[PDB]
Amino acid sequence: PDRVVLIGVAGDSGCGKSTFLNRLADLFGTELMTVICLDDYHSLDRKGRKEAGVTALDPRANNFDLMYEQVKALKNGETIMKPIYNHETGLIDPPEKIEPNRIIVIEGLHPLYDERVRELLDFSVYLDIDDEVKIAWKIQRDMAERGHSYEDVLASIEARRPDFKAYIEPQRGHADIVIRVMPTQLIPNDTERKVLRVQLIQREGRDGFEPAYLFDEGSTIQWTPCGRKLTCSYPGIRLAYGPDTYYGHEVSVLEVDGQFENLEEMIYVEGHLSKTDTQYYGELTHLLLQHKDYPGSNNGTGLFQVLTGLKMRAAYERLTSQAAPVAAS
Amino acid sequence: PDRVVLIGVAGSTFLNRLADLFGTELMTVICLDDYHSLDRKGRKEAGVTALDPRANNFDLMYEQVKALKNGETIMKPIYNHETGLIDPPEKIEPNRIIVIEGLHPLYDERVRELLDFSVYLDIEARRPDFKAYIEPQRGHADIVIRVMPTQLIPNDTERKVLRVQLIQREGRDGFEPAYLFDEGSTIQWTPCGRKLTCSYPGIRLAYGPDTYYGHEVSVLEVDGQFENLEEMIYVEGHLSKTDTQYYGELTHLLLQHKDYPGSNNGTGLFQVLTGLKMRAAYERLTSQAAPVAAS
Fold this sequence. Notes:
- The structure is a homodimer.
- Chain A is of the alpha/beta class.
- Helix content of chain A is about 30%, strand content about 25%.
- Chain A has one domain (about 1-329).
- In chain A, the strands form three sheets. In chain A, strands 2-5-1-6-7-8-12-11-10 form a nine-stranded mixed sheet.
- In chain A, helix 1 crosses helix 9.
- The interface of A and B includes residues 215 and 222 of A.
- Strand 10 (about 220-225) of chain A pairs antiparallel with strand 10 of chain B.
């Protein structure tokens, strides 16, 4: 049976605008993976939301019945006629023909909201970016290409909070992996806002997913690789690992705080992680350095995006007993 | 060459633990108070304590220790602690292992160079002389075992739970420090979790490089108390280069004698581990198995 594997990705970065999907494309290519933006399942166009007094984050702006059916149909080999939501015009355009593929990724605000869609998913990620991090990135991006559109991200973040808390954040409790990005704890007065602290929160007891750990699975550790063999600037790099309880479930939390100044530092860290699901020594580093220009490229953000990709590849290869698709050269 | 290996111990149940490891037939312990140049009255007359270099004869110490390492029998004095007198000499023959024990085994440069391994055990009126003449030997010891109050209990009224450090000197050829996880990097570890249930306050280890008396060292540290077997073994199992000869030798050796103080904490653990580092040093120098206790 030519098996379709379904992957849910939850985040607020907007469709086609996340670094994480570009990294997935780097790993799985674009021929045998198709990405579906869930905004296509809006029941209400832009005028309709205004008329009803709701945001795009509200369940009521979205058609989960149609979502479930078309996703179920794709997993079952059928072609679908799925609507197109045009973000410019704010209208719902005529349907697109989508055929099944080895990997279908569903991306957007509510891939984990509906119970029936959840059960169709083989792997899920929630990207949890602290506000202040989201803001400082936007300023860094703006500063480069002369955009100055960061006041509007802020505006959007404050105003979205109620709906974000009500309807988006609780999906974190159904995600296999949550990537949590926040400001550093290594610098007393972080004026720069560059150095990040990142947690990979990995749900336990999802058969066919073994969490990455450091040193000893199921016990708690804090680790600094800088020492006799590895010279770091200040404040250096610090990892932590340990069991925890998140949204009522057992998890295992892997954490990196700091910045990688170079190769040696990345590899040294990779080399000492366990169950990373790399297929050769230094695959994380190689994949991470593929594209140095992405934000998070030199910190735990990029590292844990790539690692999450590898856990997806493992899930896929477990379900199909076949090699996952790969990017070209 | 039937080789005599020399071990210095500064600052005991540590010696009883060594006897448990090496036995008493092929190890002889020498108490360094035997090399007092001044008896109890003599110290009083001179205005000095036993801790003063001047109360001790290092020239005689060096010669008789050098002679023992060189296979000779010696006629060494006996210092009687009860009477405070120096009694007529004792015949001491060489052995596979000679341990010299007491206040100044690491004080004299010439005696230092004769030693194959050294330990300093760091657990009112003596303070001046202790600081002047005893404590500085810590900077020449291969291993220092250090004891202090816990960091696991806020406002420690009980004073029972201890935090203990094994400070291991680097670059002593034929001594590889024990470490946790990754040699030369810094780590804090709590073994309690999914596989190991501890009662409060539990157990916490730390490892990392440091500088002690100007030298590079590697510090292994345990804070807490072992309530049971499972806890001891789990900790032992995750240590590296402990120089055990089979999985669980530390625990087995530690539980040999549960009645000793430190038996259930980092004191006993690191005394035994220090014993194993001595055994390795011995076996490296002789290309032969170290002596063992009977059954």
